[PDB]
Amino acid sequence: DTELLSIKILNAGANGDKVVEGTIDEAKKTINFPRLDVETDFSALSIEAELSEGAALQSEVMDYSMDAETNEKTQVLRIINHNRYKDYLMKVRKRVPVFGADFEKPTVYNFSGDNIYSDFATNYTRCASYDGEHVLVVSRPTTPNFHTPHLLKVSDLKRGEIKPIMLDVTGVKGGTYDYNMGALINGHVYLSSLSGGKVSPFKIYYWETPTSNPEVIANINVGNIPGAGNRHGDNASYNIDENGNGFIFFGDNAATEFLKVPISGHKTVDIGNIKVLPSKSDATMVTNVYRVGDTDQYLWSGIRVPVTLVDESLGEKYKSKIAGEAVAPKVVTFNEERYLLVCTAGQGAASKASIALEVYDLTKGETIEDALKKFDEGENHNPIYQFKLGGSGNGNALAQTDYYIEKDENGKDAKLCLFASRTQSGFVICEFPIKQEEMD
């Protein structure tokens, strides 16, 4: 007959004691095995086989020596008898570690497109934020819902249940709009008013918990800020660390500047150190400035401002090629990879922006500047993941991003959860597992 009925490697693994079964494809005359530990002594693999009556292996020991660079090697396994022989191509492979999120396995909770969150169907809601536990919807009340700003518990939304938890907004008044932007940070809620001129109150409010009374933490007289523009609060980039320290950036409507507003201890706004930073008309009113990790650098982008690495005074360090009206640029580190999370805005009825959550791979490179350079230099500039929110271009295309990382019982990253929201399109939560070794 002359064939190989079964085969095993008897001495795989660091300790040369793992028995690994082979798969024989008789039509193709091939033999495969699951990938072996990289610590295996591949120079002398001992094998055991079942053959047809009378057939012998040439040898029971095979040399699959590979250099550290190579992950696979094929050798001929010959079976012989009294006058016949048959050659099989036997492939042995090393395990290859894998990193980051598996973007091929999204779990999506969609409140956009056909399922657009109702408050997001008008320009009376221009902001939403997410922290894994809730979604904050900064809705100004309007027909027919008349919803004030509220939270939605993520566990409810995953079951398709919309159950608004309204914030206490007693005394939350002042400004051309009482509220417009906001954020969920450290389990707290922040909201800011829209100041329509020098004399319009520019207020920042804080909720310790969802059921707390509101606290006014700032009431900024824009008229007392030398160099400030006319209107603030159309956009906001809240950068507040785990100790409640950082800056809120507020670009003026005319895109002449940003107000950099310092915050410490979660609630203390330093009015004596508000800085006016130069912006440019191409940023537009839809623009954001977000801190890279716990470093002293930030990413700035806008409608006609590609994602740019800048210092804390908005001094330009590196302009990347990531554009397409990507706004709210956040750098996410997850399971040893580094991603850029953006939402494309779609500002102007004629805009051709994707209107989408987009993720770009920025893994290769030491620093964020190196990573942006390496991205720019590569052949492929497509996002590694996209979720289109639907809708079309409008005149108030404010968009937000956020993320949350779930860790396992051992403190290791397990699940990457990404959020984007866009005015008049809605919001999405997209969850991804860590990659698993292609156990092929």
* Burial label, 319 (beta-carbon count in 10 A; 0-12, 13-18, 19+): middle
335: amino acid identity, one letter: N
Residues 286/398, Cβ–Cβ less than 8 Å: yes
Q: Phi and psi at residue 343, in whole multiples of 5°?
A: -125, 130
DSSP 232: B
Residue 252 corresponds to which tokens in the numbers above? 């003026």
Tally Cβ neighbours within 10 Å of residue 46.
Answer: 15
Nearest to 281 by CA among 250, 312, 302, 309: 302
Alpha-carbon gap, residue 52 to 419, rounded angstroms = 59
- Which residue is it, tokens 């008898």? 81
- Which string of b and e fits 329-350 if b means at least 16 CB within 10 Å? bbbbebbebbbbbbbbbbbbee
- Which string of b and e fits 229-238 if b means at least 16 CB within 10 Å? bebbbbbbbb
DSSP string covering 144-203, please?
A: TT-PPSEEEEHHHHHTT----EE---TT---SSEEEEEEEEETTEEEEEEEB-STTS-EE
Residue 346 corresponds to which tokens in the numbers above? 């779609």
Nearest to 56 by CA among 77, 87, 81, 88: 81
β-bridge pairing 23-25 and 85-93: unpaired
Alpha-carbon gap, residue 187 to 189, rounded angstroms = 7
Residue 102 corresponds to which tokens in the numbers above? 């598996």
Q: Is 371 helix (H, G, I), strand (E, B) or coil?
A: helix
Residue 149 corresponds to which tokens in the numbers above? 């700003």
Alpha-carbon gap, residue 416 to 407, rounded angstroms = 9
Residues 329/389, Cβ–Cβ less than 8 Å: no
Resolution in A: 1.9
Alpha-carbon gap, residue 164 to 428, rounded angstroms = 17
| Domains of the chain: residue spans and CATH | 1-95 (2.60.40.2340), 96-440 (no CATH)
> Which method resolved this structure?
X-ray
Alpha-carbon gap, residue 403 to 390, rounded angstroms = 20
Distances (CA, A) of 175 to 224, 233, 276: 16, 10, 20
- Sheet with 18-21: list strands edge to edge: 18-21, 4-12, 45-51, 61-62
- SS3 sequence of 87-121: EEEEEEEECCCCCCECCCCCEEEEEEHHHCCHHHH
Q: Is the peptide bond before 144 cis (omega within 30 degrees of 0)?
A: yes
